[model samples]
Target: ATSQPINFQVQADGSSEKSHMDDYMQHPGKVIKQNNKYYFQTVLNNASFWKEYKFYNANNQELATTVVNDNKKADTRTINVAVEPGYKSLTTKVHIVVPQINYNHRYTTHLEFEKAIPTLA
Candidate 1:
């Protein structure tokens, strides 16, 4: 089976740039892809009870955003995300926001789905 290369972009501290999937894969996280959807998972360290994940298109247009997970404060938490509709070779971005004691932390990342032809119909 052939797998498509997906590009990623990360934004933090008021800056943004293209990111690599390998970097994230190398970390203590994981990435999963199936059909036209993808999933990224990691552990969050914060006292906030809510976390927001927003998705966008290559044109910087908003696609879908949702509060992925929320619960009692904890030092370590597994933040799992599942995004879909990745049929076309499209570039997308995601913004993560978590409100902590000091300030609201923000992170952004971009992804591109490889061109693929429908296998079955």
Candidate 2:
């Protein structure tokens, strides 16, 4: 199976392009598609008992967001999402506010997925 290319946008509101991270948790962390549904994941690194994740459509409409997990601090996580057909694209919004701090990260990575099938002849 071949992978389809979909366009997405990331918008974080703040005084500067990268300042205070006021919209840090709201950033679009990950996205995927299945059966015409668009899946999105947002990560929040803030001081709180539990944080919330907000999903939206291309028009910035709220879809659905859930905090699957927020137990471990300073740990990277993966969120599984499911979207229904009809959305050409979407925009993500972080519900939890990230703690005021200064930090940055660099990564060399690749995003790849494949369809699997069991052979029977």
Candidate 3:
């Protein structure tokens, strides 16, 4: 399932919504809230070296990070992002930057955090 990249789009209201089968590759990263936690995922298929992803805020402030332990073997990596409770909202921004390795190049992706309106309250 990791190999299957998840596609998402940002709406004008600052909410990030997922796409089912159309142009998902337009964005190579995504952030989703399930239950009460947030998850961030990205894709990389390079055959050489490893990668480290650093999470940040909308102002480019660093938050958290994770690395591809088995980069040489794994094709996809997912990370559980920790955002303080009561902090995620339609306007919340979760940014991530991945530095390039020998076979991969530096890139970034982000999600405007949101969920069902009723659930948010």
Candidate 3 accuracy as TM-score:
0.35
Worst 10 residues of 1 by lDDT: 112-121
Counting only residues 3 or more apart in sequence or on different chains, how many pairs clash (N, Cα, C under 3 Å) in candidate 1?
2
Give per-residue CA lDDT, model 3, range 1-121, as digits (tens): 1222234343432224442211222354545455664445444333132234455555555556444233445544434444443333222232223345323344344444343212222
TM-score (C-alpha, index-matched) for candidate 2: 0.38
Better of 1 and 3 by TM-score: 1
The segments of candidate 3 whose C-alpha lies over 4 angstroms from its true place after superposition are 1-50, 67-74, 86-104, 114-121
RMSD of each: 7.0, 9.9, 8.6
Tens digits of lDDT, candidate 2, 34-56: 45445544454543512444455
Residue pairs clashing in model 3 are: none
The per-model lDDT (C-alpha) reads 0.40, 0.39, 0.38
Winner of 1 and 2 under lDDT:
1
lDDT of model number 1: 0.40
Model 2: residues with Cα > 4 Å off, grouped in runs: 1-16, 22-28, 34-36, 47-55, 73-121
lDDT of candidate 2 at residue 47, scale 0 to 100: 33
Per-candidate TM-score against the hidden true structure: 0.37, 0.38, 0.35
Report how far residue 88 has shifted in candidate 1, in Å. Answer: 14
**Clash number for each model:** 2, 2, 0
